[PDB]
């Protein structure tokens, strides 16, 4: 139709495939696949196959996959190279889908679910599944229904059916406000016991077996928990029924504290959306909790509730179930906006790989390159093992801590992939080495020019300029595909307009939507036929034109990801095409590039500004420099500017018309120094920051590498109505920072940058005065409770015991056998508050489970012995002092000679 695959797996000598057929129905076949590998062969043996080094290869076709494996072992034991794709799944997909795959998302079943498990303490262990599962919400993309399984009787409390009528009402009516677009989509099912529930879920699972299985923390929590819960109740044979092929592998992960389990379900592609989100979204974040990211994207959040989640079922079972339903919806809502599932599908099919393999750049790119080469009848190298040898990364400049009033930043386009292309860095294009000087000698163009014949990197490598590098060529293919699918996206917008504009006064005539290609600008005979169309037709035609512009969108984003994920592969020892010298050629070219243009920008501005030896470039990171514009503004006289936009415009134009062209001369020269294959170092202006004109604000400041704040007015072409605060590494969003302090610090920073020292002082005085009337929870710090027992000594602090752990210990002694409520669980977060001397708790601090109130047993006592002074000093004043000191400011007004006079 054509066929495409859904999932593929290798079990024994058989490939197990789930796929949509010619008729568009989901099917499953088991194919005894017959793999071919390749071996080097003599000058004479002659054929169409050659390895990437141009050495002839003879093909070996095997009886089964097991023999092919034996063969590799054998080849490699002798010492012979064993070439070809040793992951037979990719070879299967490559042979079975030997054409560009087009897929129908709607035929692919995407399950999106969430579990709830009441436990006494709150945070149940998935590998143990000790506690009943008391709510499952499983959204199905095919049905577009939410399947809610609700346990009514449980040792932790017997409750009664959730109310879909209440769920719908507003807060005021004691409603949960489950959105209308959803309410009708909910298929509620309650159960008298857990065994009943699970069995029903398991069977529901066979009837609608997910292809892509997602949700939030589904890999680390939901999936193992459900798996182990069932393994524990019904035994393993039953638990394995969560795999279409009844095959399962339990992998363990290790870290500083515990060991996670991660269940591999053969026949299913798990795309945990938190990982998915982390890896596809181009913005780092302080939290990746569902609620935070939901707030960030949707502006709404997860359902609110009273008390701990560990008590929400007994206390408010209504809210509990509605909250579960919404948690799932939020993930859907985010995906409806961000579209990472489809992006995964698009990428998966493009590379011809298990969809989940979008999490593995080495795997993804290996497939892409393997396929590309296969069609040239080329043979891929055998993967060789290598030591994990660290190597230089990116240049980061040590900023001089200070205020920086006017600032402009420039960065480099797709730096690493650009360098790969410019230098022509591939395993087979390596042509030699040169004797190498220290890096700074190449930076300053003082070292002897490396080569007049080969393309060079400052790490002392040389590459051919004639040949066509496997790698560089392959990432160019992707730069082109991106340009191509933006074409489509635009022609599909200029076509949406042509459609929108005949919709004003169509004909009432009855006709059909035209059969045209929306990727290309409508011809003339279609320009007319479109007028004569009816509303109903034109309306379909637009839905189609828009759907196309969105396929253009997806495709071009997809390419950006591939492009950007390549270098990560190249520096990974497990990559087929890894080579340490190449990884080093790239990163140290980068360092040279940034510092060389750094010097170039400095020379230019000193010159152009009359000065000599001024340091214009104040900071730099990887592929972006930060230039101080103070002397450029003074050179013109600030007095000459009508308003903020006046000076912003001026710098925009100054960067565009003078700096950028100098910058480009600077890079063309570097290209020639290194005799590179082509110039691809393109640096353009990004941000324009500074105080509003005529105000007292400082514009911005740096406390050190990656720690700084700027008041930005322009980001490339786009300019902001109100300036944007660019804050980085100042911990004004870090989880530990008390919520009130987070808002207070951002405000301080804003005032410093936009209004001045006096405004800052006004606020500091303001917040200090207000501090002791705030809710204790908004001013408490947050920490993770790691190694609790390690520092537990008869209930008292051990040696080298962290401050927050001490708080937890103080807390445990105060709640020794009570409600019990609540309990501090290992690995989880806690609020932390200091205590004054001579408190009943017998220590200088106390910590309790975050997101909860302090049990009434001790709350008021705690609040009475809070050390506000220490709290304010450690959490607020300490950080603020760091800022002010760096920016050369006083947050408290200095004594004056006129202090005594009563003006
Ligand atoms: N040309 C080529 N064929 C390969 C490679 N790896 C596996 N093959 C096999 O070659 C056939 C395609 O020519 C398929 O049956 C693959 O199984 C490779 O790296 N290059
Ligand atoms: Cl983003
Ligand atoms: Cl971009
Ligand atoms: Cl704006």
CA R_g for the chain? 32
Residue 139 backbone phi and psi in degrees, to 5: -75, 140
Helix or strand run (H / E) with residue 809: helix 803-814
DSSP assignment of 841-902 equals: T-SSEEEEETTSPPPTTTHHHHHHHB-HHHHHIIIIIHHHHHHHHHTT--SSPPP-TTSSS-
Which of these, 470, 384, 370, lies nearest to 421 by C-alpha position? Answer: 470
CB 333 within 8 A of CB 181: no
Tokens representing 439 are: 């890096």
Burial class (CB in 10 A: 0-12, 13-18, 19+), 426: buried
Burial 435-449 (b: 16+ CB within 10 A, else e): ebeebeebbeeebee
- Report which DSSP code applies to 834: E
Cis peptide before 347 (omega within 30 of 0): no
Q: What's the sign of the alpha-carbon dihedral 754, 757, 762, 766?
A: positive
Helix or strand run (H / E) with residue 242: none
Burial 563-596 (b: 16+ CB within 10 A, else e): bebbbebbbbbebbbbbebbbbbbbbbbbbbbbb
Pocket of ligand 1 (CB under 6 A): 35-36, 49, 84-85, 91, 95, 370, 373-374, 377-380
DSSP assignment of 724-781 equals: EEEEESS-SS-TTS-HHHHHHHHHHHHHHHHT-HHHHHHHHHHHHHHHTTS-TTTS-E
Token match 């790490």: residue?
Answer: 459
SS3 state at 60: strand
Ligand 1, pocket-test mutation among 10, 38, 375, most atoms within 8 A of CB = 38
Token match 């190298």: residue?
Answer: 381
Q: Which ligand is nearest to the CA of 716?
A: 3
Q: Where are the alpha helices (H) located in 571-659, listed in sequence order?
A: 580-608, 630-636, 644-654
Technique used: X-ray
* Cα(284) to centroid(ligand 2), Å: 8
CB 781 within 8 A of CB 831: yes
CB 132 within 8 A of CB 156: yes
Residues 597 and 238: their CA atoms lie apart, in Å, by 63
Task: Outline where DSSP puts E strands in 302-354.
Answer: none
Cis peptide before 2 (omega within 30 of 0): yes
Tokens representing 134 are: 């008391």
Which of these, 593, 135, 72, 553, lies nearest to 322 by C-alpha position? Answer: 135
Residues 836 and 494: their CA atoms lie apart, in Å, by 69
Tokens representing 204 are: 């529901």
Residues 214 and 273: their CA atoms lie apart, in Å, by 6
Nearest CA to ligand 1 atom 10: 36
Residues 124 and 129: their CA atoms lie apart, in Å, by 7
CB 364 within 8 A of CB 358: yes
Residues 808 and 421: their CA atoms lie apart, in Å, by 55
SS3 state at 407: strand
Tokens representing 870 are: 């220490």
Token match 């969003």: residue?
Answer: 733
CB-hemisphere CA count at 13 Å for 544?
Answer: 17
Tokens representing 767 are: 């917040």
Which of these, 308, 301, 347, 354, lies nearest to 326 by C-alpha position? Answer: 301
Residue 777 backbone phi and psi in degrees, to 5: -75, -30
* Cα(724) to centroid(ligand 4), Å: 8
CB 518 within 8 A of CB 492: yes
Residues contacting 606, CB < 8 A, separation 6+: 612, 613, 614, 616
SS3 state at 367: helix
CB 271 within 8 A of CB 343: no
CA angle centred on 375, ends 374 and 380, rounded to 5°: 20
Q: Which ligand is nearest to the CA of 68?
A: 1
CB-hemisphere CA count at 13 Å for 882?
Answer: 18
- Report which DSSP code applies to 507: B
Tokens representing 626 are: 């930060």
CA distances from 526 to 306, 507, 531, 535, 537 (A): 61, 16, 9, 16, 14
- Which atom of ligand 1 lies closest to the CA of 37? 7
Domains within the chain, CATH numbers bracketed: 1-106+340-382 (3.30.342.10), 107-339 (3.30.420.10), 383-468+573-729 (3.90.1600.10), 469-572 (1.10.287.690), 730-781+866-888 (1.20.1280.300), 782-865 (3.40.1820.10)
Ligand 1, pocket-test mutation among 8, 10, 33, 36, most atoms within 8 A of CB = 36
Q: Which bin fits 610, alpha (ψ -120 to 50), beta or left (φ > 0)? A: left
CB 115 within 8 A of CB 133: yes
Structure resolution in Å?
A: 2.6
Residues 103 and 402: their CA atoms lie apart, in Å, by 55
Tokens representing 710 are: 């700027």
Ligand 1, pocket-test mutation among 49, 85, 367, most atoms within 8 A of CB = 85
Residues 566 and 586: their CA atoms lie apart, in Å, by 12
Kindly tell me the number of DSSP H helices and DSSP E strands found in the chain: 28, 31
CB 628 within 8 A of CB 616: yes
SS3 state at 792: strand
SS3 state at 824: coil
Tokens representing 603 are: 């020379």
Residue 248 backbone phi and psi in degrees, to 5: -145, 140
- Which atom of ligand 1 lies closest to the CA of 49? 1
Helix or strand run (H / E) with residue 13: none
Cis peptide before 822 (omega within 30 of 0): yes
Breaks (C–N over 2.5 Å) after residues, the chain: none
């Amino acid at each position: 139709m054509k066929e495409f695959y859904l999932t593929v797996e290798q079990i024994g000598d058989s490939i197990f495939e789930r796929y949509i057929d010619s008729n568009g129905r989901e099917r499953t076949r088991e194919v005894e696949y017959k793999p071919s590998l390749f071996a080097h062969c003599p000058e004479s043996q002659a054929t169409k196959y050659f390895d990437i080094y141009g050495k002839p290869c003879t093909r070996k076709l095997f009886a089964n996959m097991r023999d092919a494996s034996q063969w590799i072992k054998r080849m490699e034991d002798i010492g012979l190279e064993a070439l070809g794709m040793d992951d037979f799944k990719l070879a299967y997909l490559s042979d079975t889908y030997n054409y560009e795959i087009k897929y129908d998302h709607t035929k692919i079943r995407v399950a999106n679910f969430d579990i709830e498990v009441t436990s006494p303490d709150g945070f149940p262990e998935p590998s143990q599944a000790k506690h009943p599962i008391d709510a499952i919400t499983h959204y199905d993309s095919i049905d577009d229904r939410f399947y809610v399984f609700d346990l009514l009787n449980s040792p932790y409390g017997n409750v009664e059916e959730w109310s879909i009528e209440i769920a719908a009402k507003l807060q005021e009516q004691g409603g949960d406000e489950v959105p209308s677009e959803i309410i009708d989509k909910i298929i509620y099912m309650p159960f008298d016991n857990e065994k009943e529930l699970l069995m029903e879920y398991l069977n529901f699972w066979q009837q609608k077996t997910p292809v892509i299985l997602t949700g939030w923390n589904v890999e680390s929590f939901a999936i193992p928990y459900v798996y182990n819960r069932i393994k524990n109740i019904f035994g393993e044979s039953t638990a394995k029924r969560l795999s279409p092929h009844r095959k399962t592998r339990v992998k363990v992960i290790e870290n500083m504290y515990g060991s996670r389990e991660i269940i591999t379900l053969f026949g299913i592609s798990v795309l945990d959306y938190i990982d998915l989100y982390k890896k596809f979204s181009f913005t780092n974040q302080p939290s990746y909790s569902l609620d935070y990211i939901s707030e960030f994207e949707l502006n709404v959040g997860k359902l609110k509730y009273d008390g701990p989640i560990s008590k929400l079922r007994e206390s408010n079972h209504q809210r509990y179930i509605s909250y579960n339903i919404i948690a799932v919806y939020r993930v859907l809502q985010i995906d409806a906006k961000r579209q990472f599932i489809n992006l995964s599908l698009d990428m998966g099919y493009y590379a011809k790989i298990q969809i989940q393999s979008v999490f593995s750049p080495i795997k993804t790119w290996d497939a892409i390159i393997f396929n590309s080469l296969k069609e040239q009848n080329k043979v891929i190298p055998q993967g060789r093992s290598h030591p994990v040898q660290p190597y230089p990364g990116a240049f980061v400049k040590e900023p001089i801590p200070n205020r920086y009033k006017y600032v402009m930043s420039f960065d480099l386009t797709s730096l690493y992939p650009s360098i790969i292309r410019q230098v022509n860095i591939s395993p087979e294009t390596i042509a030699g080495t040169f004797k190498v000087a220290p890096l700074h000698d190449y930076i300053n163009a003082v070292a002897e020019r490396p080569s007049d014949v080969y393309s060079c990197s400052p790490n002392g490598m040389m590459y051919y300029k004639d040949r066509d590098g496997v790698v560089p060529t392959e990432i160019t293919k992707v730069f082109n595909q991106r340009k191509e699918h933006k074409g489509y996206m635009l022609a599909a917008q200029r076509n949406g307009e042509i459609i929108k504009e005949a919709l004003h006064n169509p004909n009432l005539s009855v006709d059909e939507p035209l059969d045209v290609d929306y990727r290309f600008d409508f011809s003339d005979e279609i320009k007319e036929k479109i007028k004569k169309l009816s509303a109903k037709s034109l309306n379909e035609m637009l839905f189609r034109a828009q759907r196309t512009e969105v396929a253009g969108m997806t495709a071009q984003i997809n390419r950006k990801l591939l492009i950007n994920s390549l270098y990560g592969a190249l520096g990974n020892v497990w990559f087929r095409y890894y080579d340490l010298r190449n990884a080093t050629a790239i990163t140290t070219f980068g360092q040279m590039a940034l510092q060389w243009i750094e010097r170039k920008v400095n020379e230019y501005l000193n010159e152009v500004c009359g000065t000599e030896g001024e340091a214009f470039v104040l900071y730099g990171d990887t592929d972006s420099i930060y230039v101080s514009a103070d002397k450029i503004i003074d050179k013109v006289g600030e007095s000459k500017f009508r308003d903020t936009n006046h000076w912003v415009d001026f710098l925009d134009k100054f960067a565009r018309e003078r700096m950028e062209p100098a910058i480009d001369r600077g890079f063309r020269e570097m290209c020639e120094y290194m005799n590179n294959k082509q110039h691809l170092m393109f640096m353009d202006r990004e941000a324009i920051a500074g105080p509003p004109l005529g105000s007292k604000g400082i514009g911005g400041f740096w406390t050190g590498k990656k720690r700084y704040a700027l008041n930005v007015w322009a980001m490339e072409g786009t300019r902001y109505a109100e300036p944007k605060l660019k804050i980085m590494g100042l911990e004004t969003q870090k989880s530990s920072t008390p919520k009130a302090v987070q808002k207070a610090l951002k405000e301080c920073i804003r005032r410093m940058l936009q209004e001045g020292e006096e405004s800052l002082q006004e606020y500091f005085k303001e917040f200090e005065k207000e501090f002791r009337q705030l809710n204790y929870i908004s001013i408490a710090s947050v920490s993770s409770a790691n190694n609790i027992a390690k520092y537990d000594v008869g209930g008292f602090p051990g040696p080298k015991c962290p401050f927050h752990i001490r708080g937890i210990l103080t807390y445990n002694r105060a709640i020794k056998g009570n409600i019990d409520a609540p309990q501090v669980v290992e690995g989880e977060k806690v609020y932390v508050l200091p205590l004054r001397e001579g408190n009943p708790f017998g220590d200088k601090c106390i910590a309790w489970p975050s997101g909860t109130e302090i049990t009434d047993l001790i709350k008021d006592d705690v609040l009475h012995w809070m050390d506000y002074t220490v709290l304010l000093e450690k959490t607020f004043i300490k950080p603020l002092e760091g800022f002010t000191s760096a920016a050369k400011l006083d947050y408290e007004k200095k004594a004056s000679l006129f202090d005594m006079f009563d003006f």
